[PDB]
UniProtKB/TrEMBL annotation:
The keyword Chloroplast does not apply. Signal peptide: none annotated. It comes from the Bacteria. It comes from Amycolatopsis mediterranei (Nocardia mediterranei). Residues 20-242 form the Thioesterase TesA-like domain. GO terms for biological process: lipid biosynthetic process. Pfam families: Thioesterase. Belongs to the thioesterase family. The gene is rifR. This is RifR.
Length: 245
């Protein structure tokens, strides 16, 4: 079951760290294929494939962020024989955070780093009536990813197969409620787009309130999907953070 959830596009047997990579609500494991190539051999990428995406399109979407986290903790166990860092974008950032919080009590060594991309701090909310994604937002964000994910849009048969799950997960993201007063103990490095309407700089810096460790905010040029255009400076930052304590 572990490799149905986790895709290893580039084996790196001598890697000093594994990086669990969690996509946004629309995204699939394949989004992270170039990162896997980029980070190996020093870091081994484990790209997460949520139920309902790509090859898992026939599976029902998860019941909640809580449930997804529960299921992912069990899946990550076999991979705990080396240090785990988490990278997540938007929805993925939330799950990354919840994983990080739960890992030690679940019987995994504490994560070595949390990279939170394109997401306001877990304690930060907005009174904006956003309880899910509009169809126009959903499609816009798929197009932005390019690759196999954007390709679905010219494939209405396959799009029909994955839409229910993607919609459900966007609703999960807005139904999400953090546990107040919790902090991870690992370093948190925050990536955010300078003109992302969904994440303000204050909201991004507020991740410092969710760790007892160092918090490093990096604002990069771009919107909600800045990470596509800004992969190089991000990868430079990630490789350095993961090359030391
Ligand atoms: Cl999302």
């Amino acid at each position: 079951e572990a490799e149905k959830w986790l895709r290893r596009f580039e084996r790196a047997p001598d890697a000093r760290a594994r990086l669990v990579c969690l996509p946004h609500a629309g995204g699939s494991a394949s989004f992270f294929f170039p990162l896997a190539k980029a980070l190996a051999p020093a870091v081994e990428v484990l790209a997460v494939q949520y139920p309902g995406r790509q090859d898992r399109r026939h599976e029902p979407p998860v019941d909640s962020i809580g449930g997804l986290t529960n299921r992912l903790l069990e899946v990550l166990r076999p991979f705990g024989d080396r240090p785990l860092a988490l990278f997540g974008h938007a929805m993925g950032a939330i799950i990354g955070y919840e994983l990080a919080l739960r890992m030690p009590e679940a019987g995994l060594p504490a994560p070595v780093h949390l990279f939170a991309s394109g997401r306001r701090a877990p304690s930060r909310y907005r009174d904006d009536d956003v309880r899910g994604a509009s169809d126009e937002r959903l499609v816009a964000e798929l197009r932005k990813l390019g690759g196999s994910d954007a390709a679905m849009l010219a494939d209405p048969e396959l799009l029909a197969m994955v839409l229910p799950a993607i919609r459900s997960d966007y609703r999960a993201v807005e139904t999400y409620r953090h546990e107040p007063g919790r902090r991870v103990d690992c370093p948190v490095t925050v990536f955010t787009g300078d003109h992302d309407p969904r994440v303000s700089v204050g909201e991004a810096r507020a991740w410092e309130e969710h760790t007892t460790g160092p918090a490093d905010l990096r604002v990069l040029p771009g919107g909600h999907f800045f990470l596509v255009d800004q992969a190089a400076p991000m990868i430079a930052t990630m490789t350095e953070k993961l090359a030391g304590p």
